[PDB]
Design a protein around this ligand. Sequence first.
Ligand SMILES: *[C@@H]1O[C@H](CO)[C@@H](O[C@@H]2O[C@H](CO)[C@@H](O[C@@H]3O[C@H](CO[C@H]4O[C@H](CO[C@H]5O[C@H](CO)[C@@H](O)[C@H](O)[C@@H]5O[C@H]5O[C@H](CO)[C@@H](O)[C@H](O)[C@@H]5O)[C@@H](O)[C@H](O[C@H]5O[C@H](CO)[C@@H](O)[C@H](O)[C@@H]5O)[C@@H]4O)[C@@H](O)[C@H](O[C@H]4O[C@H](CO)[C@@H](O)[C@H](O)[C@@H]4O[C@H]4O[C@H](CO)[C@@H](O)[C@H](O)[C@@H]4O[C@H]4O[C@H](CO)[C@@H](O)[C@H](O)[C@@H]4O)[C@@H]3O)[C@H](O)[C@H]2NC(C)=O)[C@H](O)[C@H]1NC(C)=O
Ligand SMILES: *[C@@H]1O[C@H](CO)[C@@H](O[C@@H]2O[C@H](CO)[C@@H](O[C@@H]3O[C@H](CO)[C@@H](O)[C@H](O)[C@@H]3O)[C@H](O)[C@H]2NC(C)=O)[C@H](O)[C@H]1NC(C)=O
Ligand SMILES: *[C@@H]1O[C@H](CO)[C@@H](O[C@@H]2O[C@H](CO)[C@@H](O)[C@H](O)[C@H]2NC(C)=O)[C@H](O)[C@H]1NC(C)=O
Ligand SMILES: *[C@@H]1O[C@H](CO)[C@@H](O[C@@H]2O[C@H](CO)[C@@H](O)[C@H](O)[C@H]2NC(C)=O)[C@H](O)[C@H]1NC(C)=O
Ligand SMILES: *[C@@H]1O[C@H](CO)[C@@H](O[C@@H]2O[C@H](CO)[C@@H](O)[C@H](O)[C@H]2NC(C)=O)[C@H](O)[C@H]1NC(C)=O
Ligand SMILES: *[C@@H]1O[C@H](CO)[C@@H](O)[C@H](O)[C@H]1NC(C)=O
Ligand SMILES: *[C@@H]1O[C@H](CO)[C@@H](O)[C@H](O)[C@H]1NC(C)=O
Ligand SMILES: *[C@@H]1O[C@H](CO)[C@@H](O)[C@H](O)[C@H]1NC(C)=O
Ligand SMILES: *[C@@H]1O[C@H](CO)[C@@H](O)[C@H](O)[C@H]1NC(C)=O
Ligand SMILES: *[C@@H]1O[C@H](CO)[C@@H](O)[C@H](O)[C@H]1NC(C)=O
Ligand SMILES: *[C@@H]1O[C@H](CO)[C@@H](O)[C@H](O)[C@H]1NC(C)=O
Ligand SMILES: *[C@@H]1O[C@H](CO)[C@@H](O)[C@H](O)[C@H]1NC(C)=O
Ligand SMILES: *[C@@H]1O[C@H](CO)[C@@H](O)[C@H](O)[C@H]1NC(C)=O
Ligand SMILES: *[C@@H]1O[C@H](CO)[C@@H](O)[C@H](O)[C@H]1NC(C)=O
Lengths: 230, 210, 315, 39
Amino acid sequence: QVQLQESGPGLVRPSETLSVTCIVSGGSISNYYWTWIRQSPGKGLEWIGYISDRETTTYNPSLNSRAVISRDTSKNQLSLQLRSVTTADTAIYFCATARRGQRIYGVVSFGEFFYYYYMDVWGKGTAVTVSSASTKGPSVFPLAPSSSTSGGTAALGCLVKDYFPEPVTVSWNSGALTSGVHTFPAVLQSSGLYSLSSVVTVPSSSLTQTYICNVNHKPSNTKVDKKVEP
Amino acid sequence: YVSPLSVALGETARISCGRQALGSRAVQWYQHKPGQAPILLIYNNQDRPSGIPERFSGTPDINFGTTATLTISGVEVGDEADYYCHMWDSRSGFSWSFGGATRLTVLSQPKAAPSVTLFPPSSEELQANKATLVCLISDFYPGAVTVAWKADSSPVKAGVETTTPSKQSNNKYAASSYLSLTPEQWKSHKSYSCQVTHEGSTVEKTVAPT
Amino acid sequence: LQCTNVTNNITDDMRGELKNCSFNMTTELRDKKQKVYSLFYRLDVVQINNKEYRLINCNTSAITQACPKVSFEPIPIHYCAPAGFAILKCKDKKFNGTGPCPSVSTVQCTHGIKPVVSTQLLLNGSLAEEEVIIRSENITNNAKNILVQLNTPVQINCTRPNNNTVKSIRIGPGQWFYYTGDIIGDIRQAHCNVSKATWNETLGKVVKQLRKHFGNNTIIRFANSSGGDLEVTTHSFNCGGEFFYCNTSGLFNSTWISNDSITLPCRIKQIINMWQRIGQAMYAPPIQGVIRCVSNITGLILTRDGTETFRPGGG
Amino acid sequence: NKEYRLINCNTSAITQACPKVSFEPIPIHYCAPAGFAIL
Ligand SMILES: *[C@@H]1O[C@H](CO)[C@@H](O[C@@H]2O[C@H](CO)[C@@H](O[C@@H]3O[C@H](CO[C@H]4O[C@H](CO[C@H]5O[C@H](CO)[C@@H](O)[C@H](O)[C@@H]5O[C@H]5O[C@H](CO)[C@@H](O)[C@H](O)[C@@H]5O)[C@@H](O)[C@H](O[C@H]5O[C@H](CO)[C@@H](O)[C@H](O)[C@@H]5O)[C@@H]4O)[C@@H](O)[C@H](O[C@H]4O[C@H](CO)[C@@H](O)[C@H](O)[C@@H]4O[C@H]4O[C@H](CO)[C@@H](O)[C@H](O)[C@@H]4O[C@H]4O[C@H](CO)[C@@H](O)[C@H](O)[C@@H]4O)[C@@H]3O)[C@H](O)[C@H]2NC(C)=O)[C@H](O)[C@H]1NC(C)=O
Ligand SMILES: *[C@@H]1O[C@H](CO)[C@@H](O[C@@H]2O[C@H](CO)[C@@H](O[C@@H]3O[C@H](CO)[C@@H](O)[C@H](O)[C@@H]3O)[C@H](O)[C@H]2NC(C)=O)[C@H](O)[C@H]1NC(C)=O
Ligand SMILES: *[C@@H]1O[C@H](CO)[C@@H](O[C@@H]2O[C@H](CO)[C@@H](O)[C@H](O)[C@H]2NC(C)=O)[C@H](O)[C@H]1NC(C)=O
Ligand SMILES: *[C@@H]1O[C@H](CO)[C@@H](O[C@@H]2O[C@H](CO)[C@@H](O)[C@H](O)[C@H]2NC(C)=O)[C@H](O)[C@H]1NC(C)=O
Ligand SMILES: *[C@@H]1O[C@H](CO)[C@@H](O[C@@H]2O[C@H](CO)[C@@H](O)[C@H](O)[C@H]2NC(C)=O)[C@H](O)[C@H]1NC(C)=O
Ligand SMILES: *[C@@H]1O[C@H](CO)[C@@H](O)[C@H](O)[C@H]1NC(C)=O
Ligand SMILES: *[C@@H]1O[C@H](CO)[C@@H](O)[C@H](O)[C@H]1NC(C)=O
Ligand SMILES: *[C@@H]1O[C@H](CO)[C@@H](O)[C@H](O)[C@H]1NC(C)=O
Ligand SMILES: *[C@@H]1O[C@H](CO)[C@@H](O)[C@H](O)[C@H]1NC(C)=O
Ligand SMILES: *[C@@H]1O[C@H](CO)[C@@H](O)[C@H](O)[C@H]1NC(C)=O
Ligand SMILES: *[C@@H]1O[C@H](CO)[C@@H](O)[C@H](O)[C@H]1NC(C)=O
Ligand SMILES: *[C@@H]1O[C@H](CO)[C@@H](O)[C@H](O)[C@H]1NC(C)=O
Ligand SMILES: *[C@@H]1O[C@H](CO)[C@@H](O)[C@H](O)[C@H]1NC(C)=O
Ligand SMILES: *[C@@H]1O[C@H](CO)[C@@H](O)[C@H](O)[C@H]1NC(C)=O
């Protein structure tokens, strides 16, 4: 019944204060626990910290010298700040709601129990990259059909030329066309920039339907609508 | 790091958890797809949240000595993901790091011939004095392919940038290859052929300037 | 000794309660040595000051361990008189302990008597047939301990759940020591239960007879021990082979006016000195497995202070 | 190597006999007290 939505800058300079915000739409933020996890490439995911319903924070000892988590009361959101970030803090950050359970194996009076936490509901996740290179806007070039198979089914697409950084969101007809669409993973050119391509398979009898590809690059604040035609 | 496991399609699997407990435990089993939102399957050894199918189960520690194994009945293609085993016990303190990632693999999937499409450089990109031939491969399995470029008959071997295969929503794989060239070299050679070798099969796509 | 905590990994509370100690020790050959480790309870070692430690008995006494075959469990003893002598048994159920007994019988031997060495609570003793009997030399003297005898025994359940292990190490030619090897499973606290309602009822019937020598209106209360040696201020006894010392503040904590079960935390010793002469110390070899003993508390050793307060003890 | 050790070290403690007592057996006459007899 709870929907989480992460929002972050995507690119931060080294030795700064990374800030991300998790928007919650399900329920109140003062009833369940909340936590932040990060997935770095080439490593297992790391638990970095959590905030309780009574507004008490705990942090992972490896990054406790640099991390802080806050919870907004008026807005159903929870923010995470990280001071003095380096090249190792690049990761996909997920916000998750958490429930506190205590597992007991003996007498209540003696103690002999410990609290265990579990994160049932997660957010979609926001990618955060750390680099000193500046932001670049993507160049969009329409890859026209070859007029490809024997006849009916044919392929067209849009080429997102070198940009920085990931990700690039590609849609078609502002989301009207969904059949046969396929977006491919980007490639890191030797220039240090990512390039991708997104294709659609449509019948040749339909070829004009005025297919417009909409590319959104959030770090560069670029919304480019490009037309394709033979 | 990550440790591999191989299970047949439709058979039951028992995922073993590392760093097993020293006392009473309330383990957690998490399913994480690469880049997506992780979803836990188990929060208390037996308990599962509403919506999780009955195929996944975890072993309770009814008597001290039992290990935590994630049992999956009727393994399908969608179950292929990383599995983290968060361990909480009495003798140990606050467990920060999650369990070692368990790369589940579902063998005996139906192989797919690669769907290949070759795109020549666009007119607007040629207007910018650059060319990038784009060879896209979709809907193929297994995700192990080799890409070769051919200028007429001689191989190119230069300016090629290829990505490792990555899964798509069809549970098949998708990959792209970019050949960066000057417009003069693009118009020089007659036609350019992208060859994709998948297992023993090979598919060639040729495109030429107009 | 070079000693460390066993890392509870939880809040650093009872880490010293049980401690991992490594040290060098002699072997069967005179010229060689062997470095080994063991587990010592907190009560058997004292610091030096670093993490260095030493046994409690070194500065005060010589130490010898018990042979692991003899059992410390008491068995009935019948004491007898030779020819020309007899034992006079008084069968009066309300015998104050002193004075003339009207119904007397004669025997050659007493009944079966178990030598249970206990403190503040008499364990596995004889039961009064009616009421509860209060005995003392000079009851009006606070310097004379009060012996309370019950008619309804109160059951006590004592346990150490630590699954300990023994490690045989050769000290010398023909000498095998028994150290505490490791703890299998959880590390918990040894403790004793007693049913709360039965204890309340027996305390009530004790105070009703206490009022027979102090007045119906005078208010008396029960508190823990006032101080002294360890063996006096605690419920000290021998369970399963190992020596338990249980804090008794949870028993004598009630004030009685004119007109579920409780648990008591227990610590464990194995270096024990004799209650008569200090200068001889015995090491109790550790007992494997989980220790659990059920006993009958049947008597009390109370001390008056001089309204009135009663504090247990008797060393 | 040529290192050795006594047989009794791993099993028992060892004491030597005093060199004045002789292990040569001498006759023993076993007897019964008053009120008893040997058949
Ligand atoms: C001397 O005096 C002493 C003091 O008087 C006395 O001390 C006593 O010692 C004994 C042992 O030495 C102690 O017994 C222990 O008790 C533990 C606690 O048990 C209680 O709690 C559980 C869990 O409660 C949660 O779940 C239920 C639903 O199941 C909810 O309704 C609860 O509200 C709660 O859930 C919420 O709250 C949690 C906390 O806030 C949250 O975390 C959670 O998310 C929720 O919000 C109850 O299930 C128990 O009920 C059972 O007992 C009642 C009677 O009380 C009966 O009607 C019936 O039998 C119930 O089943 C109880 O209320 C136990 O956990 C512990 O046993 C576990 O540990 C041992 C040792 O490791 C294991 O070997 C054993 O197998 C047990 O593990 C099971 O349980 C855990 C917990 O879930 C599982 O993770 C585990 O996999 C396993 O589950 C299996 O069995 C389950 C059933 O048992 C089954 O449901 C599962 O599906 C699975 O198959 C141990 O028994 C006792 O507490 C001491 N006394 C006191 C007062 O503390 C001593 O005995 C005296 N004598 C001496 C020393 O000689
Ligand atoms: C008061 O008397 C009772 C019995 O009259 C004592 O309880 C006895 O305690 C001993 C030692 O804990 C028990 O011995 C054990 O028996 C089990 C049986 O399975 C055996 O496996 C063990 O190896 C060990 O020998 C004994 O059974 C137990 N008696 C009964 C009837 O349960 C109690 O210890 C006495 N109290 C004091 C303070 O001495
Ligand atoms: C604890 O007290 C009870 C009650 O006095 C004892 O149970 C009695 O034991 C005697 C001797 O074995 C029997 O003749 C009685 O019939 C028993 N009565 C009941 C009600 O059980 C018990 O033996 C005592 N236990 C210890 C260890 O002293
Ligand atoms: C205490 O630990 C010992 C082992 O150190 C346990 O002994 C095992 O008991 C089971 C019972 O079925 C046997 O199958 C094993 O072979 C035993 N192990 C050894 C090494 O002998 C014992 O069960 C433990 N006790 C408790 C109460 O936990
Ligand atoms: C001490 O332990 C004994 C036995 O472990 C307990 O006596 C048992 O009480 C239950 C009541 O539910 C009976 O069903 C059993 O038959 C009893 N056992 C025996 C051997 O008689 C006793 O209650 C415990 N005392 C405390 C204070 O916990
Ligand atoms: C054990 O931990 C306690 C916790 O404060 C500490 O005071 C003590 O010095 C520690 N002892 C050893 C031997 O580490
Ligand atoms: C045993 O003797 C050696 C001598 O080099 C010493 O270094 C070591 O600390 C001793 N053992 C302990 C536990 O102190
Ligand atoms: C031995 O050391 C303990 C440690 O405090 C001390 O209490 C005791 O009085 C000492 N005994 C002697 C004879 O010095
Ligand atoms: C004990 O009772 C007898 C019975 O008369 C009495 O003579 C004696 O004084 C009493 N002693 C104490 C200490 O109560
Ligand atoms: C009992 O003690 C009191 C004072 O403590 C004393 O006056 C009295 O004489 C004592 N009783 C006997 C019989 O000596
Ligand atoms: C105390 O109460 C008893 C009732 O059992 C009564 O016989 C006795 O006379 C009372 N004592 C006094 C001093 O009133
Ligand atoms: C016994 O317990 C009480 C409270 O439960 C505590 O105040 C007291 O200090 C304890 N005694 C000892 C010797 O630990
Ligand atoms: C002792 O009694 C007082 C008064 O009822 C209570 O507050 C306290 O918790 C008790 N302590 C113990 C150890 O029973
Ligand atoms: C001592 O050594 C001898 C040499 O073979 C061996 O037979 C014997 O079993 C050993 N004794 C012990 C107690 O290991």
